[PDB]
């Protein structure tokens, strides 16, 4: 349990996944879901993924 | 190298098809000749043979289990293309 | 993202917003002229929601302060918290105003400085491409905050139509009528603009302030230096879901949406218990959350002068109970378990009610991470007693021939007095009709 | 190889090119009369692209300077940078000119000194067997740079047809019309030659100079000694891919090819932020590239007088963002990541747009290898506002009977005034038609 704390932060990732998949802190997801709605109102195309990667990066 | 058969064959087909756009323009007063528009009509097909084949790789880039450095570069030119 | 522009205005609205920004630096772990502590980012996970976003880790306040009286701003620059304020966002040095004491003064001064009042306050609007709204941190007492504040409730309704409007307005004092006598006139003129030209208000009574200021605070001569202590804490308490990282109703359009039943019914009752510093020596023994919300619905912490025998025919519709800091959340559902057994809130017989409880972690500070805090945002239909108090003091003054010849010389040609009287009775009749 | 001959011409074109060559010695590590530093070849990998190639490690400038006024050249020879210039390439000592202030003076003087003006400037053409082109470093203000500069745009179009033409021309000042009154006449006569007899221009407004000259430079009396400081840096900034070793668009026919949509649409907007010397004390903490291009598209560094509310119906087509020196290129794709989220550039609805970013290492010098520099070469379709400003000042002057009898005595027999008016409206109509 000490080698993860020095190098990998294993159970810190247990808390970090709760903020995105369990939606613990809402400001990460609300500033997401505000910008994220003008893309979700249209049907998805093959041009969908490329702006979804940096609508994340302007949200984080 | 982006992909072995298709994209390298798509990329050398790009540079061949605009190489005859050199040899078409290089005539004396190109766009007023009948051969200037006759040689052109094959090239207006082959240029959209290349953007639509570039369009075919982007569907393999979105539906993605292949390679991240392939996908980050080809989309970087693609929002530099479609935007 | 969620940037709110505060509109501090008037003689009393500028002082209650001055220590509101001074409260925010002590909890963010920041200094008004520098950054000496590292507690600002590891302890607090969000800071750019009321401040302007940083250029040198200097969180500029998104504040504007206009007043006719230069006395409120000359007691600011000698304080060491004024260097955080900017001398180019609002005014430079030696700013002035009118003479001046009239409701018709600031109502007529809005269209002669119309070019300058809509120039520098709009520069902060396009800083963020998704503006939250506007809060008018103004006053009802006097003619300074009530005269000019009624103008911006009209022209910002159509120029910025998709923005939230909601104000923390303070009510004036009705003890004697010697120093001021124009109090029934300028109050009802702004109160009409607070219902149809404004969505929500947060009422703050003045006669209920000295009820609390002699309750536990133990003063003999009531001064104006105590009016900023009860007000600045509950202002920062109302944005604990918005400033500190919360999940549900973490926006200002989140909290107000779950409490307003209908337009022109938006007057929210406020409550806040812990104000005593000698409680600190006995909170070390795990003082729980099971006893802090039993006294919120009990009419002891209220800041609204209302009748004590008028609560049997009135019914609560929406009640907010905000706990902060250490909550011990394994018993917060246990505190809400005991609500249905007492029925201390009368429930509306036509529809359901709601007791909403929420939590957020407080500042990394020793008086904040140790003592339980309870903020109440009630909505009870006994609020017409204040509207019956103001209207009975309004029609009695018009039969005494008071300020009918002294008030209609400037910019008033027709009798707009019954235009305020019927619309106030429309509020008072639709409140009692709302429980069928 | 890539040798360009600069055509410095006029009263203002000679002074802006005088410090342009004076800027080049401070960054090449060379002296105008000797070579005292070894930094010229190890630090700079290419020097013979604007200078003439060396005979004794003396990099002669490939420059010609003709003007009717002898005052601009008499302030040159006493400066210690004139020994780098040659007294046999252009003129020997005591060169003169006309009297003289007329557009028809230099337009008629071109064919009487036709033998000598095409004799000594062609000796530098056959020095390199692959000539790049010609840049006319001339002026629009006055009749000196506008009268003779319109002649060489015609006779060098067919005698040298396979060469690039593109000019860094400065626009005159339109504040009052007392000292000069011939300003609408000589400007539009050269502006017709800049579109059909010339491929590209680089516009440089005069009313936008004092907008920047009082912005951060803090002067009280605007003099002509400040007009050479904003101009000479962006001239050397435009050739950083060409002088310093770059890879893509490292030629002058590389940069201009990727920005021009069509002929007669070539007016490029210029922007350049860093001009302050006290920024140097805080660039030691790794000031990044992520904040320097957020302010380029923001209309603050622009040198073009345009409308602020006319950018919603106009669309960018080509935008260049040149970073220089220390770039930290692991985040230069990160800076281009944030462009699509704001959409600060309106994009054309008929075709694609392009945000091109490029880098090149700067001079081995301490103010150059420490502070980030951003050069903008925009192309926005709001440039017709200047063409609407010049045309409205052109037809209003012809109805006042101004310079219709005082201008047609020499070498003008027919009315060529509407020949300039329709061709200017052809530019203004095809710009708005270009976004379908």
DSSP string, D81-133: TSSSS-TTTS--SS----S---HHHHHHHTTTSHHHHTTSSSTTTTTSSSEEE
Q: Where are the beta strands (DSSP E) in chain B?
A: none
Tokens found for residue A20: 């995105």
Q: Is A47 on the interface with B (CB under 8 A)?
A: yes
Sheet holding C316-324, edge to edge: C63-66, C3-9, C131-135, C164-168, C200-202, C267-272, C373-380, C316-324, C354-360
**Chain B: partners with 3+ C-beta pairs within 8 Å:** A, D
- Chain C residues inside the 8 Å CB shell of A26: 245-248, 250
CB neighbours (10 Å) of residue D18?
23
Distance CA D348, CA C372 (A): 58
The SS3 assignment for D284 reads helix
Q: How many CB atoms lie within 10 A of CB C253?
A: 14
Chains D and A touch (3+ CB pairs under 8 A): yes
Query: A48 CA to chain B: closest CA distance, Å?
Result: 8
10 Å CB burial of residue C337 (0-12, 13-18, 19+) is exposed
Tokens for C302, please give them.
Answer: 């209220």
If residue D355 lies in a helix (H) or strand (E), which one and from where to where?
strand D354-360
Report cis status (omega within 30 of 0) of the bond before C100: yes
- Best mutation target among A12, A27, A35, A38 (most C Cβ atoms within 10 Å) is A27
Question: Which of C2, C130, C247 lies at the smallest CB-CB distance from A23?
Answer: C247
CA atoms C246, C252, C256, C258: torsion sign: negative
- The partner residues of C61 in beta bridges, in order of sequence, read C51
Pairing of strands C373-380, C316-324: antiparallel
| CA D338/CA C329 separation, integer angstroms | 40
Beta partners for residue C376, in sequence order: C271, C321
Closest alpha carbon within chain B to D352: B83
Q: Does B55 touch chain D (CB under 8 A)?
A: no
Q: Measured between alpha carbons, how far is A27 from C47 in angstroms, rounded to an integer?
A: 11
Cis omega (within 30 of 0) for bond into C47:
no
Per DSSP bridges, beta strands C131-135 and D200-202 are unpaired
Given a contact cutoff of 8 angstroms between Cβ atoms, the answer to whether D236 and D24 are in contact is yes
The secondary structure element, H or E, covering residue D147 is helix D144-159
* Preferred mutation among A20, A26, A30, A60 to probe C, highest tally of C CBs within 10 A: A26
What 3-state class would DSSP assign to D369? coil
On chain D, the residues whose CB falls within 8 A of the CB of A54 are 337-338, 340-341
Q: In this structure, is the dihedral angle defined by the CA atoms of residues A21, A24, A28 and A31, taken in order, positive or negative?
A: positive
Catalogue the E-assigned strands of D149-289.
Answer: 164-168, 200-202, 267-272
Half-sphere exposure of C110 (CA within 13 A, CB side): 19
Distance CA C79, CA C63 (A): 17
If phi > 0 it is left, if psi is from -120 to 50 it is alpha, else beta; for residue C403 that is left
- Give chain C's count of helices (H) and strands (E): 15, 9
d(CA C69, CA A54): 50
What whole-number distance in Å separates Cα of residue C70 and Cα of residue D264? 58
Tokens of D417: 């005034």
Nearest to C20 by CA among C57, C71, C69, C62: C62
Shortest Cα distance, chain A CAs vs residue D46, angstroms: 39
Q: Which residues of A touch B56 (CB under 8 A)?
A: none
Find the Cα–Cα–Cα–Cα dihedral D35, D36, D37, D41, rounded to 10°. 20
Which chain A residues have a beta carbon less than 8 Å from that of C251?
A: 30
Q: Which of C427, C418, C337, C327 is nearest to C383 (CA)?
A: C427
Q: How far is CA C202 from CA C16, C74, C260, in A?
A: 14, 28, 12
Q: Are D21 and D62 in contact (CB under 8 A)?
A: no
Burial class of residue C209 (count of CB atoms within 10 Å of its CB; 0-12, 13-18, 19+): buried
C150 burial via Cβ count (<10 Å: 0-12, 13-18, 19+): buried
Experimental method reported for this structure: cryo-EM
Q: What angle do helix axes C183-193 and C384-398 make, rounded to 10 degrees?
A: 130
Is residue D104 within 8 Å of D410, Cβ to Cβ? yes
For D273-280, which contacts have Cβ atoms below 8 Å and span 24 or more sequence positions? D273/D300, D273/D301, D273/D374, D274/D371, D274/D372, D274/D373, D274/D374, D275/D212, D275/D216, D275/D217, D275/D230, D276/D216, D279/D371, D280/D367, D280/D370, D280/D371
Torsion, CA D333, CA D338, CA D341, CA D347, rounded to 10: -70
């Amino acid at each position: 349990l000490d080698v993860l704390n020095k190098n990998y932060n294993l159970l810190e990732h247990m808390q970090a996944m709760r903020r995105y998949l369990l939606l613990g802190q809402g400001d990460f997801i609300r500033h997401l879901m505000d910008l994220l709605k003008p893309e979700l109102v249209r049907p998805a195309t093959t041009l969908y993924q490329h702006n979804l990667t940096g609508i994340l990066e302007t949200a984080v | 190298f982006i992909l072995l058969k298709p994209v390298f064959h798509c990329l050398n087909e790009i540079l061949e098809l605009c190489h005859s756009f050199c040899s078409l323009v290089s005539q004396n007063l190109g766009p007023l000749d009948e051969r200037g528009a006759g040689q052109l009509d094959i090239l207006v097909k082959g240029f959209s043979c290349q953007s639509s084949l570039l369009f075919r790789i982007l569907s393999s880039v979105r539906n993605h289990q292949i390679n991240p450095d392939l996908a980050q570069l080809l989309l970087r030119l693609d929002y530099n293309k479609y935007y | 993202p969620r940037e709110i522009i505060t509109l501090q205005l008037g003689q009393c609205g500028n002082q209650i917003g001055f220590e509101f920004w001074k409260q925010l630096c002590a909890e963010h772990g920041i200094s008004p002229e520098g950054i000496v502590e590292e507690f600002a980012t590891e302890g607090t996970d969000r800071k750019d929601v009321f401040f302007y976003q940083a250029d040198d880790e200097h969180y500029i306040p998104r504040a504007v302060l206009l007043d006719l009286e230069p006395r409120v701003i000359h007691s600011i620059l000698n304080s060491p918290y004024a260097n955080l304020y900017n001398p180019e966002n609002i005014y430079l040095s030696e700013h002035g105003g009118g003479a001046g004491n009239n409701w018709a003064s600031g109502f007529s001064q809005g269209e002669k400085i119309h070019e300058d009042i809509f120039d520098i306050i709009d520069r902060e609007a396009d800083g963020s491409d998704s503006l939250e709204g506007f809060v008018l941190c103004h006053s009802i007492a006097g003619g300074t905050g009530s005269g000019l504040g009624s103008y911006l409730l009209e022209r910002l309704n159509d120029r910025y139509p998709k923005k939230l409007v909601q104000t923390y307005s303070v009510f004036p004092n009705q003890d004697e009528m010697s120093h001021v006598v124009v109090q029934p006139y300028n109050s009802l003129l702004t109160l009409k603009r607070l219902t149809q030209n404004a969505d929500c208000v947060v009422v703050l009574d003045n006669t209920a302030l000295n009820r609390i200021a002699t309750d536990r605070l133990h003063i003999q001569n009531p001064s104006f230096s105590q009016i900023n202590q009860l007000v600045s804490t509950i202002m920062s308490a109302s944005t604990t879901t918005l400033r500190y990282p919360g999940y549900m109703n973490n926006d200002l359009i989140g909290l107000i949406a779950s409490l307003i039943p209908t337009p022109r019914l938006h007057f929210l009752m406020t409550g806040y218990t812990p104000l005593t510093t000698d409680q600190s020596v006995a909170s070390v023994r795990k003082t729980t959350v099971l006893d802090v919300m039993r006294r919120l619905l009990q009419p002891k912490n209220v800041m609204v002068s209302t009748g004590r025998d008028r609560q049997t025919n009135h019914c609560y519709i929406a009640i907010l109970n905000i706990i902060q800091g250490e909550v011990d959340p394994t018993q917060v559902h246990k505190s809400l378990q005991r609500i249905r057994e007492r029925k201390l809130a009368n429930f509306i017989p036509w529809g359901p009610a709601s007791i909403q409880v929420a939590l957020s972690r407080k500042s990394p500070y020793l008086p904040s991470a140790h003592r339980v805090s309870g903020l109440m945002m009630a909505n009870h239909t006994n609020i017409s007693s204040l509207f019956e108090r103001t209207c009975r003091q309004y029609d009695k003054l018009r039969k005494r021939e008071a300020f009918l010849e002294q008030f209609r010389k400037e910019d008033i040609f027709k009798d707009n007095f019954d235009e305020l009287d019927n619309s106030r009775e429309i509020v008072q009749q639709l409140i009692d009709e709302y429980h069928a």
